[PDB]
């Protein structure tokens, strides 16, 4: 059976209970925590690519008021559907299963200034999603995998001082 497990789920949950935030910048910022998954039940003999995108979580934007996140407006038009290709792609099932798959180099931006960066809208909530794409497949069989534990609001600066502190503690 194909199984994709979130690594460091307890760490992600510490951020999620505060409401997680990720900085977006013109030139793009790496994530903390980093999304990492374990994988079993691929065909070790087959080749696959791992793609990461970010799904808009809500039909409204958010704002941090009196130390609480609350609905903050109607959403902006959706960011373009940017996909990050895991740099080990394409690779054998055996490669993906031998150790956890880390998306440590993906950068989140608020400027379409290129460079395999992911464009997000500030004060919108996103859910990371991984796709496993089988290589050489005339059916183009693909799996999708959502990580609710890893939901965050994109921000140009941290709103919650507890997030700023957690980011320093664990990073």
Ligand X SMILES: O=C(O)COCc1ccccc1
Give the distance, in angstroms, between the CA of residue 40 and the centroid of all CA atoms in the same chain.
20
Q: How many CB atoms lie within 10 A of CB 93?
A: 20
Residue range at the interface with ligand X (CB under 6 A); choices 39-47, 97-105, 119-127, 153-161: 39-47
Residues 40 to 59 in contact with ligand X, rule: CB under 6 A: 41-43, 48
Q: Encoding tokens for residue 80?
A: 């373009």
- Count the Cβ atoms, other than its own, within 10 Å of residue 99: 10
Q: How many Å apart are CA 160 and CA 70, to the nearest integer?
A: 13
2 binds ligand X (CB under 6 A): yes
Question: Residues 26, 65: contact at Cβ < 8 Å?
Answer: no
Task: Please report whether residue 143 would count as binding ligand X according to CB under 6 A.
Answer: yes
* Residue 141 binds to ligand X (criterion: CB under 6 A): yes
Which residue number, 41 or 87, has a Cβ lying nearer to ligand X? 41
Residue 132 as a binder of ligand X (CB under 6 A): the answer is yes
User: Does 134 contact ligand X by CB under 6 A?
Assistant: yes
Q: Which residues of the chain form contacts with ligand X (CB under 6 A)?
A: 2, 41-43, 48, 132, 134, 141-143
């Amino acid at each position: 059976e194909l199984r994709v497990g979130l690594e460091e789920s307890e760490l992600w949950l510490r951020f999620k209970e505060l409401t997680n935030e990720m900085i977006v910048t013109k030139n793009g910022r790496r994530m903390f925590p980093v999304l990492k998954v374990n994988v079993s039940g691929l065909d070790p003999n087959a080749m696959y690519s791992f793609l990461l995108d970010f799904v808009a979580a809500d039909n409204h934007r958010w704002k941090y008021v009196n130390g609480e996140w609350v609905p903050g407006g109607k959403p902006e038009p959706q960011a373009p559907s940017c996909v990050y290709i895991h740099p080990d792609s394409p690779n054998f099932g055996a490669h993906w299963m031998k150790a956890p798959v880390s998306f440590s180099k993906v950068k989140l931006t608020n400027k379409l200034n290129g460079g395999g960066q992911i464009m997000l809208n500030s004060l919108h909530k996103y859910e990371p999603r991984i796709h496993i794409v089988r290589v050489g497949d005339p059916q183009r069989m693909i799996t999708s995998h959502c990580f609710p534990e890893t939901q965050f609001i994109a921000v140009t600066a941290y709103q919650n001082e507890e997030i700023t502190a957690l980011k320093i503690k664990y990073n």
